[PDB]
Amino acid sequence: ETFWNSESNAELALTSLYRGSLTDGVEYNPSDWWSYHGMIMMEHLSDNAFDRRGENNPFFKISSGNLTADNAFIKRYWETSYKRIGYCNRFLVGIQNSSESEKKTRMIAEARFLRATQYFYLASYFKNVPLVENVLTGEEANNVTKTSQADILKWCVTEFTAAAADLPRFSAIPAGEAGRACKQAALAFLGRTCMLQKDWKSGAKAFHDIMELGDNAINANYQELFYPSTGTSNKENIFYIQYLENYLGTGLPQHALSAKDGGWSLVNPAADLYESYEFKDGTPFSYDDPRYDPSNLGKDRDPRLDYTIYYNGAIFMGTEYKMSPDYSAAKKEKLDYTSEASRTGFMMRKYFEESTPINDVQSANGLTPVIRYAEVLLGYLECLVEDNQTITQGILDETINAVRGRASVNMPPVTEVTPAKLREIVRHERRIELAMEGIRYWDIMRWGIAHEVLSQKIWGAPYPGSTQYATTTKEVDPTGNYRWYVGKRAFRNPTDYTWPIPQSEQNINPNLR
Numbered sequence: 459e460t461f462w463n464s465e466s467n468a469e470l471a472l473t474s475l476y477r478g479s480l481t482d483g484v485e486y487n488p489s490d491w492w493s494y495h496g497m498i499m500m501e502h503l504s505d506n507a508f509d510r511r512g513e514n515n516p517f518f519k520i521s522s523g524n525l526t527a528d529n530a531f532i533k534r535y536w537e538t539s540y541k542r543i544g545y546c547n548r549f550l551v552g553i554q555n556s557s558e559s560e561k562k563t564r565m566i567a568e569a570r571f572l573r574a575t576q577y578f579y580l581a582s583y584f585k586n587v588p589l590v591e592n593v594l595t596g597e598e599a600n601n602v603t604k605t606s607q608a609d610i611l612k613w614c615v616t617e618f619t620a621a622a623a624d625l626p627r628f629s630a631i632p633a634g635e636a637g638r639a640c641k642q643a644a645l646a647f648l649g650r651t652c653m654l655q656k657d658w659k660s661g662a663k664a665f666h667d668i669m670e671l672g673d674n675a676i677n678a679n680y681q682e683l684f685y686p687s688t689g690t691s692n693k694e695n696i697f698y699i700q701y702l703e704n705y706l707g708t709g710l711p712q713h714a715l716s717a718k719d720g721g722w723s724l725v726n727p728a729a730d731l732y733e734s735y736e737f738k739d740g741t742p743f744s745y746d747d748p749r750y751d752p753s754n755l756g757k758d759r760d761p762r763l764d765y766t767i768y769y770n771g772a773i774f775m776g777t778e779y780k781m782s783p784d785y786s787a788a789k790k791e792k793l794d795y796t797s798e799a800s801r802t803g804f805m806m807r808k809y810f811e812e813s814t815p816i817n818d819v820q821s822a823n824g825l826t827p828v829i830r831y832a833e834v835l836l837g838y839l840e841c842l843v844e845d846n847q848t849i850t851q852g853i854l855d856e857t858i859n860a861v862r863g864r865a866s867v868n869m870p871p872v873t874e875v876t877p878a879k880l881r882e883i884v885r886h887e888r889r890i891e892l893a894m895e896g897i898r899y900w901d902i903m904r905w906g907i908a909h910e911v912l913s914q915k916i917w918g919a920p921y922p923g924s925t926q927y928a929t930t931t932k933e934v935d936p937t938g939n940y941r942w943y944v945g946k947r948a949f950r951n952p953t954d955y956t957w958p959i960p961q962s963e964q965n966i967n968p969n970l971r
Contacts (some may be wrong), residue, residue: 462556471549472565475572476637477706480536480699483821484709487517487534491579492699492828494710496535497896498809499725504898505911506731506889508722510801513945518647519880519956521912522900523948527961536584536960539576546573547593560686567624571639571647574617581610582900583957588615588970618648628673628696636690636700643697646829649837654904662841665834668696669856674831678865681765685811689825692810697829707821711812716805717790717798719775720819727767728805729917729941731893734758734886736880740870745920752922761867766893768807769919775812779805781919783926783942792929793942795800802944803919808894827895832861836888843884849875857885903955912949918942 461467479489488496502509505519513522525532547570556562580587589605597757605613622644631640642661645664652661675693682688689695701708715721733743738758744750749758753771756764768774770781781803785791790799809826816822816859839857842849854872862869874880885905889898902908921927922940933943957971 462552465556465559465561467522468549468553468556468562468565471545471552472568472964475542475546475549477570478542480706482706484712487531488538489534489612491535492826494708494713494824496538496825497828498826498894500882500896500899502725504902505728505914506850506893506898507728507806508726508802508916508944510722510726510799512795512801521908521947521949521954523950523954525954525957527958527964529960531582532957533960535579536963539580540584540590543573543590544593546570546576547591549594549775552866563624564626565646567621568639568830570617571621571625571644574614574621577610578614578647578654581607581614582654582903585956585957586610587959595749600966601969602826602967608655609716611651615648615655618644618651622648625917627671628693633690637698638848639697642671642674642834643829646696646834648839649834649841653837653841656844658845659839662845662847665838665841668831668834669838673835676831676835676860676864680762680864680866681808682786683827683830684809685814686823687811687814687826689827694831695825695827695829696831696834698825698827701822701824701826703817703821703823707818708824708826709820709822710809710824710826711816711822714806715810715819716774716779716800717783718777722798723790723805725801725806725894726800726918726944727806728802729804730771730911730918731768731889732763732804732919734889734893735763736869736890738869745937746963752920754921759891760869762890762893762964764807766806766808767804767867769804774805774807775810781805783921783924783930793921795932801918802916803921806894814971832864832891833897835861836884836891840881840884840888842876843880844882846877847864847876849880851875858884861887861891885903906955907954909951911950912947912954915946916944918944933948 480493485493485495489763490496501507509515509518516529519525520531532724546569579837585607586604588602590602591609602733622641625639625641625644628640630640631638645668649661649664652664674696677683677692677694683695690700711721713722714725716723737740737749751757755769762971768779770779772779780791781793781800783793787794787797790797793803859871862871870885875885902911918941921942935941964971
């Protein structure tokens with residue numbers, strides 16, 4: 459009532475809309491689509507990575523062929539979404555009659571952006587869900603009906619478009635507003651919404667609008683995009699989550715560092731990601747190529763491999779990572795099926811600013827991008843290809859080659875303009891560029907290839923020099939490359955393209971059965 463008489467009170471409410479259910483530190487399940495477990499660890503559901511908790515862990519079961527409606531992780535995603543939606547709805551109603559101002563107009567756009575992102579993610583995975591815009595009582599909420607995915611996505615287009623119009627451009631966001639949604643953040647989600655609709659023409663336009671605004675650019679340094687000290691002082695990270703150790707610190711280090719650095723090794727990259735990176739001359743990787751060096755897995759490979767993952771013998775935080783079937787379990791250096799250590803032989807390097815001390819691995823500074831300009835450039839190109847628009851070398855140079863040409867990466871430029879061939883090149887570049895950032899599952903789902911890439915066994919790092927490998931891997935690598943057997947998936951086509959409505963909600967509301 460009187461609360462809304464004050465712009466500072468509106469600002470306070472808006473801070474809660476951004477925060478959602480995120481809390482300080484370690485989380486054992488998602489607290490938001492953008493939390494470390496909600497976003498980054500979705501890579502565990504993809505062909506890029508594995509969850510150390512293993513094949514029986516219900517998070518991993520989301521895409522392994524074993525998802526059921528009583529799953530605790532899908533219920534978290536559902537409830538945190540609808541909790542934020544409900545607070546956005548109250549905010550949008552409550553602010554309507556407050557004094558007009560530029561700040562009021564901006565904050566309405568921020569609330570609409572935030573609400574629409576929740577429906578974007580709900581629509582990506584649950585697909586057909588209640589579209590709630592009004593403040594409901596508990597009873598009313600228990601009797602809502604589903605809206606189709608197509609109708610939700612159309613609504614998201616309208617909402618992201620309206621939000622973008624009234625959000626400041628990226629260049630107008632000062633340092634003190636780091637983390638706040640800009641025009642380009644809303645346009646990037648608009649573009650992703652259009653790709654889900656397969657409205658490729660509209661998606662190309664949304665991403666191209668970001669490019670033509672001219673506020674963003676590819677950063678010279680790839681690693682620094684993901685570090686707290688540098689991640690907000692570049693022109694590439696459009697939308698991100700900043701963690702400040704005195705406020706809501708991130709527990710990602712506790713969870714994803716290895717034992718030598720105080721962590722629990724929860725995040726484990728897989729062999730199929732390791733194998734995806736090109737050689738330095740841009741040709742595809744093969745274990746049969748003489749450039750493959752089992753003593754230095756990142757040597758003569760795309761620099762993004764060593765920037766993103768590490769492995770036995772690599773240096774991380776100034777000391778050597780030791781991980782092998784031959785090493786000591788007491789030292790948490792053994793690769794096995796039980797220790798508090800990597801299940802694959804790989805670890806994630808991305809997001810860890812190695813030269814800067816971390817005072818508390820359970821509540822650290824951190825910076826996790828949600829929308830990067832590299833995704834915008836690759837998204838634009840993907841949309842043009844899918845919309846049957848002619849690709850020129852100029853277009854390649856402004857998109858895929860700007861991403862590959864980043865100074866710290868400097869990979870050979872693409873010249874392919876044949877659309878069928880370019881589709882696979884762009885999808886692959888996107889896989890490499892965005893690896894371990896929580897987008898791969900979203901991509902393999904929307905592309906309709908999840909049932910192909912998640913129909914397979916999961917392998918780990920190669921160990922040709924291991925004496926214990928032959929008798930301790932659950933299965934000897936049938937390709938002859940001595941990769942560790944990690945586990946398997948049997949994603950169901952079509953069932954696992956859609957998450958079921960959580961069981962508790964089906965039980966309450968007959969319209970959701």
